[PDB]
Amino acid sequence: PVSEKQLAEVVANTITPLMKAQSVPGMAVAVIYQGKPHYYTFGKADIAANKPVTPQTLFELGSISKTFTGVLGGDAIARGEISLDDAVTRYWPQLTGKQWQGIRMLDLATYTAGGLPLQVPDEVTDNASLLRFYQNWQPQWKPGTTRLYANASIGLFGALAVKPSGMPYEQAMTTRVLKPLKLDHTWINVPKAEEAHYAWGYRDGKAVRVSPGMLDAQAYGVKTNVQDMANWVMANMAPENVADASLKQGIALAQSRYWRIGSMYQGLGWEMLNWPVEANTVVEGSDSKVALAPLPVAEVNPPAPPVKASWVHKTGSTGGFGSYVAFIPEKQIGIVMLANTSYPNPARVEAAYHILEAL
């Protein structure tokens, strides 16, 4: 049974050399081992103000925000409010272009609509321009044939998934997901009273924070601390412990397997590989060259329910932040790495695999 002081040793020996090689200002780390969350903090949250990183320090999750979007969407399906096979036009009737015919909610959620772009153009600033962007979009591929990771895709999924609730995205997310799991320090909009905890991200010696953007909340705008994130991983790793029924099923639906892309499977927000897996496979798959590339998919119909023998993970970044989350349900172990500088994905995955290897 790994000793507590042995776990502390492993973490330090992997993280300190990482921060020195990658010039990382600060980092909060959480390792889940045998039903227990272990926190480790390093460096500075604010270089100028010389504020240290603490368990209450808030970091920008960037794309890991998509795991929340997927679970919220999952909860909505579990309630009967939406169906994955539903047409997108059912929820947004103004989307009249013929190219939208045949596109389902599943496609928006899993990046298989046919080439929706990585980013929403900054030229888009309101409902009118947002509608125009989608009406004029010309697909490169037919639906359900190619996966192309994109904010413009799952971003719209989240915006539409909450319409039946009648609540605004931020409210739906707080009342159906955050409050039930007691994630009291997870925000889309950081309150005045909590700003003292919001770290600064760094890029090229400059201090930056994420900028407002269309569909930002649904695709990359969540901020949180290592504690709420640790409890987020535990809720997803062991969903039987979740009290609310729709939420519990929502989490199962987000970890289901809808498509196979080589050795990886696409869930709602979450990405999975079968466990056991070699390090090289997870690491090279995380490189922008593969991760952002368009690749062919194989449909998993019926969708396969959650497989415990899986490596479930998600990378996430913003201009000045770099984060990573990974867990293996069968072994009940997980890891959270939040940093205030965006360093290469491969280096993040390698560090996490090494640490989980010692458990």
UniProtKB/Swiss-Prot annotation:
Cell compartment(s), UniProt: Periplasm
GO terms under biological process: antibiotic catabolic process; response to antibiotic
One GO cellular component, as annotated: outer membrane-bounded periplasmic space
Transferase among keywords: no
Disulfide bonds: none
Effect of T341K: In strain: MHN1
A GO term, aspect molecular function: beta-lactamase activity
PANTHER family: BETA-LACTAMASE-RELATED, D-ALANYL-D-ALANINE-CARBOXYPEPTIDASE/ENDOPEPTIDASE AMPH
Family named by the database record: Belongs to the class-C beta-lactamase family.
Protein's UniProt name: Beta-lactamase
Organism: Enterobacter cloacae
Gene designation per UniProt: ampC
